[PDB]
């Protein structure tokens, strides 16, 4: 278990912020580590009208860097520091790694299909327009035709980045939400 | 419910953020000094309990989680005072910290239920670890209450003796010619003057 | 008993007020700063209990509700000190707050009864929730006391050994030629001088 | 449940007075509301030599404005503020509404008979002069011949008021008792 | 483990000292003000516990014996604060003082195990005096949990009602157009904007 | 034992005083400021107990009644500090106040006996109200200890694993080349230099 | 139960002294009153080598002025104030009343024999000179030949007093012991 | 039990040091005294790779001066004061008395053999060079040929002392370890 001083010098959180984060983390996980199932149970209760299990699995794999099957407080604050306190490029790299399931270095259409299926599973089966059973497919199509630039059937980190900086709404979303907290 | 992992969920939204097609809403101001490092004091019959304010905010619709708490605040001492039982209040507070309510087997079920009712806790939130114990004890106490409803006469004689003593105390006050006693006797004298009738000693 | 709804009853008298035929009595002065916001401290063996003064005034004829309480006040610390058991005092105070007395099953019945007697509480005010438990425990302890009245010899040998030790301690003090011990030995020497006889060592 | 600030701005009690009232109310009613039976049980123990049940029913109906079958702390302090802190006309309106059982706008002789029966039930069955079994009837007669002015067999709010201000003893009773506390 | 007799063992080495053939190592600096007379304060939910720092250092690999404790220190008040149950913390602290863990029979086994897990204590360190009691209670609670795994439907209905209430609260917030509730609703609105779909009321 | 009625006995000597034939001894000086209004503080693991000094002086030959108490005094805070269990200390103090010792049924008999031994209380001073309970519990715990003397192997494996871990920790310290650990490893290195032999890793 | 202020104005003890006395009295007698048997049990443990029961009975009868069979705190501090704080004549009157068993106004030889039997019962059956079984008789003889002056076979309060002031040792005993405490 | 003041005036420890020592001693021995078996149990857990029972017996006999079979806190701090706070000659006398099992005034080769057997029992049965089963014998030989000067087959206190002051390593060991703590 990394100490408070080492976490202070590694992450971008202050001593008070790390203490509050540890307080909450241990209040939910008294053992100091969380497995995938307890992680899903924690994450689900923010989405009372959908199924967040698949997206929670993606998050757990992304956060648990050393692939121990357990997210420790170190994994927790490392990921939270990269997302909440990192630069826009750091967040974009984190999101790209989330999408790239095999971590090979590219995003295929089926990889993005898994991600959008996980995201739409939170919308629930009883939504306003329809449960079209194809909205993730065409959303993947839109994401590719926006992100991909050489039209090679895949998304690379360069195209992901440059397409992201070419979208003002993405900038607004990055600066506002992940910096207010 | 779980506000500790709310920043985690807000951060996890970053996986949604790039794939969204369209704008995003305005983030909340949240300008309340982060509502952190409060450590409010709940003084229960002289016993100091300390807790984070957000811990209490986890469960609104209860006394401690709502603005009803304000009825018990003492600005002079900067603490909430409750004229209640502190030992049962320990379990009340543990509920806020964990979400589950435990039932102490050594305490009276009536006292426990009265403290639950006072603080707005519903007995159905007792965890399965303690629910069978609580249900059995509540069943015995319901059985006693029903057996009484359908040794009571000692209670009845005691309450009648108490009313007779109150009437005799008012009569002796009249004969002579304790703020509560004085105001109550004034109310009884007002009743006398209303009805133009006077009480008389029962013996 | 219930001074909290006394203002409600005094207000409710307004339904009597117009239909009365004749004058009305003089209302009480009640000039005691409303006897509110006191929050007196009862220090029981180092444990601080806090309560409203009117809560204690609800039940006179008991120690805490009467002027007998004044025997335990410490003006230097502005608190009442009791050299009693605080855990049982919790139930003592709960009685004033609710009107009913609960019996903790985990405490000795003798200690509980001694604390009840000290604070002027009668065991018949125990609520029906706890009365059967209390009665059963008191029955077992009466059975033990009667069985002794009609393994005691260990107690008898211990007390005789204690008296022999006290006599030997006084004899050793005489041989040599602890304020309590010094004053007690002075009293025994005064008894010697009164009777013109002296004690001698038992062995 | 109305907050402390809203009750402060609605009633005429201070923050300390409302806090003391809430303390007592919750000490007797931990749930924060009181039904008719618990209300009767509370009110009876101020009258240890009579039966206050009927007058307690009248009080409960008068205090419970929204006819929920329950008197909340809001009902409690609203009534207490009207009686203890209101003007003499406010108290007189409250008393007139107490007497007018059907709330139609007038007091009949049978309505007043019910009220005086309830009041005399507190005197008890063992009093000084006698339990004449007709004292409420002639007391109603006296009340009508004092209050009613057009002798129409009924009491209206105008006659009630003006007859009340024409009785000095009623003024003394209003100013003294309901203002000392 | 036992640092109190460590100076005794170091002194006892004097029997080795003359018969040694060869030099001796360099003694440790031990320049930390002897780490004595500390008397640190552990504030558990408002209850002050006091202990010597070396007492806690007796058992590293636990929360209180390790640097993990630093996560709970409050430099403003110069104390450690724990939002935990103080009654069970008494036994937690007794473990450090004696080395053995006792199990209180009157407490829920689930609460006890959660407090043990929080503070890094392993249930196998419970002394033989209490181990059979603890094992029996844990067996009953495992039996309950397994019987549930293989009256639950009340819990399931309650949790579904809670999720429905949360969804309805978010819908009512949308209709209107509590910091936690505001941030959570903002997150849900962000999810809506991500999927270009909106929620609708279940009824 | 009973110093409260000692002035009564000294006054009662006035019935002896006139009928004595001969002189009387010199009364004691008793110049110690009457040893009254002390209200000393016994801090047991952060829990404040308060008592009169004469109450403790009632029973010498125990820790609190003797000068052994001085070993636990803290002149800086003007209080006695004990790193012991406060819940059992409540009964310890009740013994001084009443003369009888009660046994709490909910506490472990081993912990209770250890606290009795620490404070110099003999188990034979337990009152008859609690003596049968205490004797039965002590009999069960003796039966357990004897059954062990004549599932232990888990304890034996744990202690052997602890010694192996200590030896491995010292070996790893040697390989690298926590004040207690440093001094203990220095002592082990001194033993090595004494015997001119070195330890080696068990695996 | 007399209050602290009334006991302050009745006895000669201060508020602190009365509080300490009440503390001890209630520590031995939680009910606030003591009967003859509990009184004997309290008094005996000051005399671990004799039998104080008879003298304790005499003391209980002397202290319990209203003959209720119970010594209250009022009886307790009234007697203690007369003895410890009264004048020498007050103490002498108290002792004379102790000796005069029938309270008629004189001390006979058999009354004094009962008193000296009670006093010698504290000496125990195993003393230095002997248990002569006649020492109380000759001690009564000495007391009478010292106290009685008209040799009428009885002691009156006048002879008791004047003989007491004619004995310097009695003065030393009165001033020293009953004033140091 | 000797008081804190008497132990202060007897030993060379301060009040704080004696209080800390008593705190630890009573934490291990609540009764205030320790027998040989509990002493062995305490001492063994400093040597997790050997058997310290024989050396612990020697220590217990050396510390328990009055041969009561029990080491009290007085024995404890007296020995600790002689060793930790005494002069080099005091420590040397203490060690010589430890070696002289019969306390006659001389150290024989078999007495030293018992001591070195006890010391080597702490080394354990699994050490680096070998468990030669004769290392204590030749270590006794070396100790005698270093300490003994008249070669009489025995060690006297004079030879022990003077040989000790003639070994600089012994001085370094005495000054450093038994004075740092
Ligand atoms: Ca991990
Ligand atoms: Ca890929
Ligand atoms: Ca591409
Ligand atoms: Ca209502
Ligand atoms: Ca009408
Ligand atoms: Ca009319
Ligand atoms: Ca009396
Ligand atoms: Ca006579
Ligand atoms: Ca004469
Ligand atoms: Ca010894
Ligand atoms: Ca020898
Ligand atoms: Ca030689
Ligand atoms: Zn539970
Ligand atoms: Zn109960
Ligand atoms: Zn145990
Ligand atoms: Zn008992």
UniProtKB/Swiss-Prot annotation, chains A, D, G, H:
GO MF term list: calcium ion binding; ER retention sequence binding; identical protein binding; potassium channel activity; potassium channel regulator activity; protein-containing complex binding; transmembrane transporter binding
The protein's assembly and partners: Component of heteromultimeric potassium channels. Identified in potassium channel complexes containing KCND1, KCND2, KCND3, KCNIP1, KCNIP2, KCNIP3, KCNIP4, DPP6 and DPP10. The KCND2-KCNIP2 channel complex contains four KCND2 and four KCNIP2 subunits. Interacts with KCND2. Probably part of a complex consisting of KCNIP1, KCNIP2 isoform 3 and KCND2. At least isoform 2 and isoform 3 can self-associate to form homodimers and homotetramers. Isoform 3 interacts with KCNIP1 in a calcium-dependent manner.
GO biological process: action potential; chemical synaptic transmission; clustering of voltage-gated potassium channels; detection of calcium ion; membrane repolarization; membrane repolarization during cardiac muscle cell action potential; muscle contraction; positive regulation of potassium ion export across plasma membrane
Annotated family: Belongs to the recoverin family.
Location of the region described as Interaction with KCND2 in the Swiss-Prot/TrEMBL record: 168-181
Portion held of the full protein: 90 to 270 of 270
Domain EF-hand: residue ranges: 1-48, 51-86, 87-122, 135-170
Binding site for Ca(2+) 2: 100, 102, 104, 106, 111
UniProt binding sites for Ca(2+) 1: 64, 66, 68, 70, 75
Name this polypeptide is given: A-type potassium channel modulatory protein KCNIP2
Sequence positions that bind Ca(2+) 3: 148, 150, 152, 159
PTM entry text: Palmitoylated. Palmitoylation enhances association with the plasma membrane.
Keywords: Calcium, Cell membrane, Ion channel, Ion transport, Lipoprotein, Membrane, Metal-binding, Palmitate, Phosphoprotein, Potassium, Potassium channel, Potassium transport, Repeat, Transport, Voltage-gated channel
Tissues with expression: Expressed in brain. Colocalizes with KCND2 in excitatory neurons including cortical and hippocampal CA1 pyramidal cells. Isoform 3 is expressed in heart and in umbilical vein endothelial cells. Not expressed in fetal heart.
Gene: KCNIP2
Function of the molecule: Regulatory subunit of Kv4/D (Shal)-type voltage-gated rapidly inactivating A-type potassium channels. Modulates channel density, inactivation kinetics and rate of recovery from inactivation in a calcium-dependent and isoform-specific manner. Involved in KCND2 and KCND3 trafficking to the cell surface. May be required for the expression of I(To) currents in the heart.
One of the record's GO cellular component terms: Kv4.2-KChIP2 channel complex
Superkingdom of the organism of origin: Eukaryota
From Swiss-Prot, chains B, C, E, F:
PTM description: Phosphorylation at Ser-164 in response to MAPK activation is increased in stimulated dendrites. Phosphorylated by MAPK in response to signaling via the metabotropic glutamate receptor GRM5.
Predominant location category: membrane
The protein's assembly and partners: Homotetramer or heterotetramer with KCND1 or KCND3. Associates with the regulatory subunits KCNIP2, KCNIP3 and KCNIP4. Interacts with the regulatory subunit KCNIP1; this interaction mediates the capture of both the N- and C-terminus of KCND2, preventing N-type inactivation and stabilizing the S6 conformation, thereby accelerating closed state inactivation and recovery. In vivo, probably exists as heteromeric complex containing variable proportions of KCND1, KCND2, KCND3, KCNIP1, KCNIP2, KCNIP3, KCNIP4, DPP6 and DPP10.
Keywords for this protein: Autism, Autism spectrum disorder, Cell junction, Cell membrane, Cell projection, Disease variant, Epilepsy, Ion channel, Ion transport, Membrane, Metal-binding, Phosphoprotein, Postsynaptic cell membrane, Potassium, Potassium channel, Potassium transport, Synapse, Transmembrane, Transmembrane helix, Transport, Voltage-gated channel, Zinc
Miscellaneous note of the record: The transient neuronal A-type potassium current called I(SA) is triggered at membrane potentials that are below the threshold for action potentials. It inactivates rapidly and recovers rapidly from inactivation. It regulates the firing of action potentials and plays a role in synaptic integration and plasticity. Potassium channels containing KCND2 account for about 80% of the neuronal A-type potassium current. In contrast, the potassium channel responsible for the cardiac I(to) current differs between species; it is mediated by KCND2 in rodents. Is specifically and reversibly inhibited by the scorpion toxin Ts8 (AC P69940).
Organism (species): Homo sapiens (Human)
Residues that coordinate or bind Zn(2+): 102, 108, 129-130
One annotated GO biological process: action potential
Sequence ranges on the Cytoplasmic membrane side: 1-150
A molecular function (GO) term: voltage-gated potassium channel activity
Job description of the protein: Voltage-gated potassium channel that mediates transmembrane potassium transport in excitable membranes, primarily in the brain. Mediates the major part of the dendritic A-type current I(SA) in brain neurons. This current is activated at membrane potentials that are below the threshold for action potentials.
Lineage summary: Eukaryota, Metazoa, Chordata, Craniata, Vertebrata
Keyword Ion transport in record: yes
Protein name, entry field: A-type voltage-gated potassium channel KCND2
Positions spanned in the full protein: 4 to 497 of 630
